[PDB]
């Protein structure tokens, strides 16, 4: 049963949530290989764990920069959640630690690259190719939401493709364990639900809205609301209007009208039937949810590899030092990390 699987999952999660792992490695145990992504909100590197020779993705945050950006609690959320979860389409923390300058989160490496890269290159995905990825997100959100977690940053940039062509939902910087309503303005303009833009209290329904955005973007090759500046995007999102490409199936358009529903009473994922209004929709009729979860469905695209620690599916970024001060920074702020 799904209910019963989730009950056991929650028991597993709560135990780790209430007693988080802490200080389970050291920077000197890893060989730094390459920057896989980078921004104001930190960076992610491929590293090699020397004791096992396993490759991992290592997120590095500069404690001082986190503080300046008011992301202290959000970062504590990220680490505390990611050490506790366990799901085929999430990369839980294998290790975390900190030093005088930085916070380190070490996770399973997905060598296939960001969905963003393949989506942009290829143009758009077929409806079946998109449905295969969407199915994985639906299951992940069912899992997360059952643990009272909201994700808050769905987009192809955060979705990594693994060796089998299945995805990992990465970057939990805005993820939060909340019962009831929350208020933080966060996420990415194109994927922001109207509630968020209009400064309302909001709930897990914003993730189901973001799903509508992702499915649209995957199938169309561009997002349903775009413009050159965020403010113009926000005007489109709250308008209540969306246009679909002529090639979108009838089933696809119907799913999306119900995901991209400005009215919370009518948004799929937020009705009394919850996620099953999505899972039982005609667009997913061919989807075997257990086969997806078990990862026995054949991926519509498997990525090119040329070995372990291959990075050819990732863009090249300027490589910056990992500096470690001789003075501890922000000790109290990140005491629990």
């Amino acid at each position: 049963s799904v209910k019963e699987f989730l009950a056991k999952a929650k028991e597993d999660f709560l135990k780790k949530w209430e007693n988080p792992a802490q200080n389970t490695a050291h920077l000197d145990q890893f060989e730094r290989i390459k920057t896989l992504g980078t921004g104001s909100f930190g960076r992610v590197m491929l590293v090699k764990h020397m004791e096992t020779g396993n490759h991992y993705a290592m997120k590095i945050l500069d404690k001082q920069k986190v503080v300046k950006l008011k992301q202290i609690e959000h970062t504590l959320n990220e680490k505390r959640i990611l050490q506790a979860v366990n799901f085929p389409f999430l990369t839980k923390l294998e290790f975390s630690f900190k030093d005088n300058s930085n916070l380190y989160m070490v996770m399973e490496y997905a060598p296939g690259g960001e969905m963003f890269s393949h989506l942009r290159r290829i143009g758009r995905f077929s409806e079946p190719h998109a449905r295969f990825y969407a199915a994985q997100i639906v299951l992940t959100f069912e899992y997360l939401h059952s643990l009272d977690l909201i994700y808050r940053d769905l987009k192809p940039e955060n979705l990594m493709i693994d060796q089998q062509g299945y995805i990992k939902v990465t970057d939990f910087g805005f993820a939060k364990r909340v019962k009831g309503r929350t208020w933080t303005l966060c996420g990415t303009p194109e994927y922001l639900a109207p509630e968020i833009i209009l400064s309302k209290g909001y709930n897990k329904a914003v993730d189901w809205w973001a799903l509508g955005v992702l499915i649209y973007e995957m199938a169309a090759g561009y997002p349903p609301f775009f413009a050159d500046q965020p403010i113009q995007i926000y005007e489109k999102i709250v308008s209540g209007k969306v246009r679909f490409p002529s090639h979108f199936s009838s089933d696809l358009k119907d799913l999306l009208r119900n995901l991209l529903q400005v009215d919370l009473t009518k948004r799929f994922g937020n009705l009394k039937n919850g996620v099953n209004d999505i899972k039982n929709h005609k667009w997913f009729a061919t989807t075997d949810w257990i086969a997806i979860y078990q990862r026995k469905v054949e991926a519509p695209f498997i990525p090119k590899f040329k070995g372990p620690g291959d990075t050819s599916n990732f863009d090249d970024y300027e490589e910056e030092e990992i500096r470690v001060s001789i003075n501890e920074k922000c000790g109290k702020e990140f005491s629990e990390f």
């Binding site: 921004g39 909100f41 942009r120 933080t184 050159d228």
Partner: peptide, 20 residues
């Protein structure tokens, strides 16, 4: 076309998160 309008826009690259 909508595709052409997208490709000519400033937001075809990786998109940054926002905040207060």
């Amino acid at each position: 076309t909508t595709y052409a309008d997208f490709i000519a826009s400033g937001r075809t690259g990786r998109r940054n998160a926002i905040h207060d």
